Description:
Oligomer: homodimer
Bound molecules: 4-Hydroxyazobenzene, fe (iii) ion
Chains A, B: Lignostilbene-alpha,beta-dioxygenase isozyme I
Radius of gyration of chain A: 21 Å
Assembly: dimeric
PDB class: oxidoreductase
Entry title: Crystal structure of Sphingomonas paucimobilis TMY1009 LsdA phenylazophenol complex
Number of helices of chain A: 2
Keywords: aromatic compound, lignostilbene, carotenoid cleavage oxygenase, lignin degradation, bacterial catabolism, oxidoreductase
Amino acid sequence: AHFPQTPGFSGTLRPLRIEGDILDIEIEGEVPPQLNGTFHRVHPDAQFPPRFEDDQFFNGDGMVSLFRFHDGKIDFRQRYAQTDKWKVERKAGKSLFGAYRNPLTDDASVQGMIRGTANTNVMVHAGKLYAMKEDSPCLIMDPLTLETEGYTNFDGKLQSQTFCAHPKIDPVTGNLCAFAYGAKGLMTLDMAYIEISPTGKLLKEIPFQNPYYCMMHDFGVTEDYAVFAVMPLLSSWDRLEQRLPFFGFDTTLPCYLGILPRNGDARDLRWFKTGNCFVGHVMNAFNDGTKVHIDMPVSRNNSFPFFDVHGAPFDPVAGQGFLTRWTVDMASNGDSFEKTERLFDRPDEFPRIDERYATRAYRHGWMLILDTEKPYEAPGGAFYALTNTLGHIDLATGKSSSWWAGPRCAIQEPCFIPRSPDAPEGDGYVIALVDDHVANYSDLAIFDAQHVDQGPIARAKLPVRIRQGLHGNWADASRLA
Amino acid sequence: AHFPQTPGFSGTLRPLRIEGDILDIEIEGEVPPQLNGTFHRVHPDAQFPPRFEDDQFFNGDGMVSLFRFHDGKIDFRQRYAQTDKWKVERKAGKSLFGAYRNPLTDDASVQGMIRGTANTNVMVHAGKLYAMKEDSPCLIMDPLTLETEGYTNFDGKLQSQTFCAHPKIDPVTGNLCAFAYGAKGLMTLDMAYIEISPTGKLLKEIPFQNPYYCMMHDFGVTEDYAVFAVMPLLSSWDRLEQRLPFFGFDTTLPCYLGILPRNGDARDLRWFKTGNCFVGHVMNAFNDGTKVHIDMPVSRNNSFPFFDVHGAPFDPVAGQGFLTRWTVDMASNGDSFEKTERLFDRPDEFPRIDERYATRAYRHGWMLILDTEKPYEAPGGAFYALTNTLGHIDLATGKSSSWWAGPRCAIQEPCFIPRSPDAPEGDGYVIALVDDHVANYSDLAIFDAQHVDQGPIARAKLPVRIRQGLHGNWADASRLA
Ligand SMILES: Oc1ccc(/N=N/c2ccccc2)cc1
Ligand SMILES: Oc1ccc(/N=N/c2ccccc2)cc1
Ligand SMILES: [Fe+3]
Ligand SMILES: [Fe+3]
């Protein structure tokens, strides 16, 4: 139809809205022949024009992309996640749900429905594909056909209304370790830590309470504890009644770090306190005894202009997040941090690890780098959320390498793949969508994990440019059993 | 995975190979709200890399695109035509058939199979979609789902092995009027004129003989006769044994024009003779009494670099085709033409008419114009087959108007739609795919048929660039019953 001619739908953020398939993608170079598995990712892509022309980036319907690696070939499939919102709006032929996380602006016909778009994360678990959005239950899809089974409550057991979009895989038990904030509705302090068995059965749902009505986007999991970074990105029902953005960052309130024993309950929860800041995605987290470390980009204010926060608009310099380790001790009194240490001196986000070392001690990480010292010759805005560099950091030595995508391209969230099941940490490949904004083409580029500076060793050249996405994951073919 | 790095697969001729859908295409401007129907077109698009790195453009598997118009909205669907070749090659995962129209280069596993790609024309008839390739029978598909039913012989009646890709619709009887060359196999002089009832039943299959083993791509149909333009674009089994392109244009042999009474047989066929030249697509053809006129672009040699002709590579100046009327008389003795008259002074091809006046006297025509005096700012060659202008000609007065697509875009074969069932000749709309080769985007542009100079009145903006195609047709929704 007629989408708004606003910057949110023009330029590189133009609507895509195409589901389809491609058999045997064009390959420049050679795909690692031993690779055999599935790479899932997802982007927001409103099926119809929004009700309000200022609709946020995070409110678009979820479009899931599957790249199946097998025998040096890559197949492409892309489908809409058939959420309840998507089904009802397709039947209606127009957009019925309102602004981001604002049910006071919804149409009367869909009142009370699950407003999730499942546009934030996609991960293969328990033989199915979990599609996740923070404000809604987990949606279940087929990993290979991308058909939508629908929202789940895990055989009826799960009591929480929501389900996070950043679960971690326990590298010993294979359990899905997730959480949920706003578990009893919007603007509710209820929280839950959740563990799902490798067969999809809910194992534990430990409830507790949160310091604020704040966004809990990501969290950490260690061998013994679950870590929750609480930042004062607040929400107010009063502010929703005033037709303002749902989230809004208070620069006066402090930040908390909640450590919960995985085999405990809310009584065992310990809160630590630190200065005001903005926390991003958790690279990893691990515990040495009672010492708990968590790694994440920290910044003064909004870490991405995709967020529409209350107050002043985007501050491009205060939003620079740097990879930082927070260290608390469960063996100490009080609520004081043991250490905060900046790990990387360039503004970065979307961190990644060798997922085999999740929850455990590690050293190799990959990230997107916002390099402003580089030119950008593409008309159509989008200079601010421009993640144009891919970087690899060795945390054991501080050495780092990087790779620039040129003045035409941007990069999406990378993902690591091991060379062999029992290969050294970070020994393998890093894949990521590189987007040429001049020619409008997307390459699934594959780098050497240890030599990302050497550029890609292979590119799966697509005949279309995939829209700006969020998170994706790799799963070996064996996980489809 | 690895396509040849030749110009035939690089630049604007890159492989597309994406089947998919788009619900409610982005519309710049307004689509005529009364329009309700289907626009089908098709382009070559080899599913896998070829067996020979010099594969021609016409040898790629057929990719069919449907634009459904309804209530001012347009939906997009695109699917592979599942020919026997396509199915067997997908089962094999690689290309099994050899060079263009050369079974001597095929793999042993597909010997005897139908090597058609159904990549030349797609037209709605008898409630189904006929997908056509000159060297193979007609393929039957679903007009709305683009599902493939398969090759047909029309309840077993049709004796011809082949089926042309340029059928004409009788504006009185509703019959599909087609022909066939090589009807008894490759390199056979056997020809057939064919009529299919509006319910799909074979009505006539009148066989005759051809002057040469030559390409019969298009033909004419009048109220009383069928017209066959014979040009010495020859093929030889020797030429296949010598691993040469299937076709090769002899500049020494003459051209013929065969007029056959539609309700007659081979004895009634009359051949007329004229000088050597190259004939293109038939705009229209009609008879006034015994006088028979046919309109088509004529040129010295190869009219498009899509063809690989024997001898020297493409000559862009000898290849300029001009719309020309040939006129013979069935009441005169001998084989002399009554008149040959050039109707349009600019190099043109892909002509189109108000199909309501097919086989009858007419005046309004549309065409693609090769305007070489215009700039073209796209890197990657392809300055030669650049159809950058859309033109409308009034044959009753010789007046003509045109429209340039700019230095970034090219145009594909247009198609006419009447404004209303009872509108004057050429009163309506002209639709065509305009392709931005710098940004790689395709718009289904809609013009006023009488004021194409006023630019498009609407654009269905796609988030992808459709490959260079061949022929398409429009069908009202009523024809889907
Ligand atoms: O529904 C949601 C909710 C939160 C959300 N955060 N994204 C980001 C992206 C980058 C840094 C920090 C947060 C995205 C979608
Ligand atoms: O399979 C085929 C066979 C013939 C063919 N001719 N195209 C043209 C195009 C322009 C002028 C004359 C012929 C196209 C595809
Ligand atoms: Fe995120
Ligand atoms: Fe043609």
